[PDB]
Design a protein around this ligand. Structure first.
Ligand SMILES: Nc1nc2c(ncn2[C@@H]2O[C@H](COP(=O)(O)OP(=O)(O)NP(=O)(O)O)[C@@H](O)[C@H]2O)c(=O)[nH]1
Ligand SMILES: *Cc1c(O)ccc2cc(-c3ccco3)ccc12
Ligand SMILES: [Mg+2]
Lengths: 163, 308
């Protein structure tokens, strides 16, 4: 069973933990408990292969250089209800490529809280447009609460690591 | 600020801030987790290295136990401390009454209990007949691999690599390969039966329901030795849980004896280094030599006193 080291990055409150917990445990985390550093394990099946996923759930503020040296795939999450969390991801994308010394890094852009369509501040096209600049990077709008686009965040990173 | 990793048996962990440094208590760390008062009452902080596990108390300072681990090893074991670095774990409270566990509905508490139970099963600490182990393996297949598909699972899917994750390691060699057809049949029955819920926490509770009748369920395991009646040394695991006392052969995990509270008696040795067990009607007696005898007897007294 091949092991996959995935890292969930992004500013605070975007739902990095809620997405990971929904994926791994099937529960929607309601309370806002700021993360220090959580790690999860989960076996899945991607393309007829049994994969052991080690998902690192990081802090909205921060040890970041080590996460990128060791991580194989990176989910860059923002909230579609907070513009600042969208703006912050440009530095994360650039710093990842800097540590990896390459642009061929398994990466997915995730716009979370898509169940809050009314509170939306960041449009879908602006998110797709960002992923286009990022060398046609993968993009998903997801919702940890509605279980929308949750599993395919991590399935897509596994496939990008395998290519 | 100071922080510590609190692990679980599946290798995952959660980092918690130590507000008072190494003076932080188990109670304060339990508050630092993402556990409601409902999830929190079933579990506590353990400190375990490779060959010694200790459940801590709310007033204990776990980081001072980590600091004093070489002395704790020398007091309770005969191991060399250079291959034993301890970590802190969140595990089932050994005092948790089975009657209380059977009423749990919280999905998080179930998954934490399920993960610990699966860890004990795969390592061989759950002694049970073939039919019970085959049922547990079928539930693990549904939980981990999802619905049964004849295209995917009917033939050559249950190799040793896949069998290792659903059967005890002690049975993987000379018993498990003969179980595959019975495992896949129960696996298929689980998926094609809409009368059983495929909800994750519902499947995990089914797994625990089968584990609740295994004699060693929820047991704290100590290490000791017994002498055979012409004397040979037999290393043993001493399992103490809310049901009673159980002895496993260390090498094979085979269940030597299982005694329920009210059918046996205990007595601490004069030198603390051993304890004696007297069974009723069995009319037999054995003595276990262990530097943990002081802990074994104390735990036996509390868990016996819990039963009404
Ligand atoms: N409506 C809605 N709320 C969500 C969604 N995802 C997360 N939330 C809520 O947003 C809050 C913050 O979520 P959280 O997962 O803690 O975000 P985080 O990125 O892990 N925060 P941090 O970086 O500090 O650890 C919580 O109250 C959570 O319930 C979603 O898809 N929809
Ligand atoms: C003395 C005592 C009390 O009062 C409650 C629980 C205990 C648990 C242990 C234990 C569990 C695993 C290893 O040791 C020891 C003492 C306990
Ligand atoms: Mg978080």
């Amino acid at each position: 069973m091949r092991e996959y080291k995935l890292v969930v990055l992004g500013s605070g409150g975007v739902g990095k933990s809620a997405l990971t917990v929904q994926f791994v445990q099937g529960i929607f985390v309601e309370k806002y408990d700021p993360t220090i550093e959580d790690s999860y394990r989960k076996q899945v099946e991607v393309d007829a292969q049994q994969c052991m996923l080690e998902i690192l759930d990081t802090a909205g503020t921060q040890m970041r250089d080590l996460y990128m040296k060791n991580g194989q795939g990176f989910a860059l999450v923002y909230s579609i209800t907070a513009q600042s969390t969208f703006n912050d991801l440009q530095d994360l994308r650039e710093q990842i490529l800097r540590v990896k010394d390459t642009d061929d890094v398994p990466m997915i852009l995730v716009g979370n809280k898509c169940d809050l369509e009314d509170e939306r501040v960041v449009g879908k096209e602006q998110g797709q447009n960002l992923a286009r600049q990022w060398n046609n990077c993968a993009f998903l709008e997801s919702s940890a609460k509605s279980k929308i686009n949750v599993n395919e965040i991590f399935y897509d990173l596994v496939r990008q690591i395998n290519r | 600020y100071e922080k510590v990793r609190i692990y679980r048996m599946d290798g995952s962990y959660r980092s918690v801030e130590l507000k008072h440094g190494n003076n932080t208590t188990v109670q304060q760390i339990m508050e630092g987790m993402r556990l409601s008062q409902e999830t929190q009452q079933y579990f506590t902080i353990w400190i375990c290295s490779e060959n010694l596990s200790l459940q801590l108390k709310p007033y204990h300072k776990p980081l001072q136990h980590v600091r004093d681990w070489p002395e704790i090893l020398a007091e309770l074991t005969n191991l060399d401390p250079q291959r034993e670095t301890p970590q802190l774990f969140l595990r089932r409270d050994v005092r948790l009454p089975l009657e209380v566990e059977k009423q749990i509905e919280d999905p998080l508490a179930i998954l934490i209990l399920f993960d610990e139970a699966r860890y004990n099963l795969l390592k061989g600490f759950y002694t049970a007949p073939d039919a019970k182990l085959i049922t547990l393996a079928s539930l693990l297949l549904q939980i981990v691999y999802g619905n049964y598909e004849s295209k995917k699972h009917k033939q050559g899917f249950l190799n040793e690599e896949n069998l290792k994750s659903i059967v005890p390691v002690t049975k993987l060699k000379s018993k498990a390969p003969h179980w595959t057809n019975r495992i896949l049949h129960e696996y298929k029955n689980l998926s094609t039966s809409e009368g059983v819920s495929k909800e994750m926490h519902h499947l995990q509770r089914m797994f625990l329901q089968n584990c609740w009748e295994i004699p060693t369920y929820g047991a704290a395991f100590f290490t000791g030795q017994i002498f055979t009646k012409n004397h040979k040394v037999i290393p043993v695991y001493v399992g103490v849980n809310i049901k009673g006392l159980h002895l496993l052969n260390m090498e094979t995990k085979a269940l030597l004896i299982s005694l329920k509270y009210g059918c046996f008696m205990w007595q601490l040795g004069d030198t603390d280094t051993c304890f004696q067990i007297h069974s009723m009607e069995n009319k037999m007696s054995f003595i276990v030599h262990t530097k943990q005898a002081g802990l074994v007897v104390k735990l036996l007294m509390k868990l016996n006193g819990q039963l009404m």
